[PDB]
Swiss-Prot record:
Subunit architecture: Monomer. Homodimer after ligand binding. Interacts predominantly with FGF1 and FGF2, but can also interact with FGF3, FGF4, FGF6, FGF7, FGF8, FGF9, FGF10, FGF17, FGF18 and FGF22 (in vitro). Ligand specificity is determined by tissue-specific expression of isoforms, and differences in the third Ig-like domain are crucial for ligand specificity. Isoform 1 has high affinity for FGF1 and FGF2, but low affinity for FGF7. Isoform 3 has high affinity for FGF1 and FGF7, and has much higher affinity for FGF7 than isoform 1 (in vitro).
Organism: Homo sapiens (Human)
Ig-like C2-type domain segment(s): 5-98
Subcellular compartments: Cell membrane; Golgi apparatus; Cytoplasmic vesicle
Region (Heparin-binding), start-end ranges: 12-29
Task performed by this protein: Tyrosine-protein kinase that acts as a cell-surface receptor for fibroblast growth factors and plays an essential role in the regulation of cell proliferation, differentiation, migration and apoptosis, and in the regulation of embryonic development. Required for normal embryonic patterning, trophoblast function, limb bud development, lung morphogenesis, osteogenesis and skin development. Plays an essential role in the regulation of osteoblast differentiation, proliferation and apoptosis, and is required for normal skeleton development.
Included range, full protein: 150 to 249 of 821
Residues that carry a glycan: N79, N92
Domain notes: The second and third Ig-like domains directly interact with fibroblast growth factors (FGF) and heparan sulfate proteoglycans. Alternative splicing events affecting the third Ig-like domain are crucial for ligand selectivity.
Pathological condition linked to this protein in its record: Crouzon syndrome: An autosomal dominant syndrome characterized by craniosynostosis, hypertelorism, exophthalmos and external strabismus, parrot-beaked nose, short upper lip, hypoplastic maxilla, and a relative mandibular prognathism.
Post-translational modification: Autophosphorylated. Binding of FGF family members together with heparan sulfate proteoglycan or heparin promotes receptor dimerization and autophosphorylation on several tyrosine residues. Autophosphorylation occurs in trans between the two FGFR molecules present in the dimer. N-glycosylated in the endoplasmic reticulum. The N-glycan chains undergo further maturation to an Endo H-resistant form in the Golgi apparatus.
Protein name: Fibroblast growth factor receptor 2
Gene behind this protein: FGFR2
Protein family: Belongs to the protein kinase superfamily. Tyr protein kinase family. Fibroblast growth factor receptor subfamily.
Positions of disulphide bridges: C30-C82
Length: 100
């Protein structure tokens, strides 16, 4: 019973536009399921998002399908996309961040 990825709690993904004041913490989530367990990765404005891309780097919490960025700064604005994959499929969702 192998299966493509799918989102398990779309309610937490409803709100796509987030305006947050510098230097708060932002936490984005893409709760998913599938079999085998899909891997998760994040892109910032369509390109692979790596630790070395912002001073504070970020924490990815695998069991929670979440991306966490502490003390956001203006250069943190942009589109954040989670890409969830296994051999039976690849799915994505994009959040937009505005640092006030």
């Amino acid at each position: 019973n192998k299966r493509a990825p799918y989102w398990t709690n779309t309610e937490k993904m409803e709100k796509r536009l987030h305006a947050v004041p510098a230097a708060n913490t932002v936490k984005f989530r893409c709760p998913a399921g599938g079999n085998p367990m899909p891997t998760m990765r994040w892109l910032k404005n369509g390109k692979e998002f790596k630790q070395e891309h912002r001073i504070g780097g970020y924490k990815v919490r695998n069991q929670h399908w979440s991306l966490i960025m502490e003390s956001v700064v203006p250069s943190d604005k942009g589109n954040y996309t989670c890409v969830v994959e296994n051999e039976y499929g690849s799915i994505n969702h994009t959040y937009h961040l505005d640092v006030v």
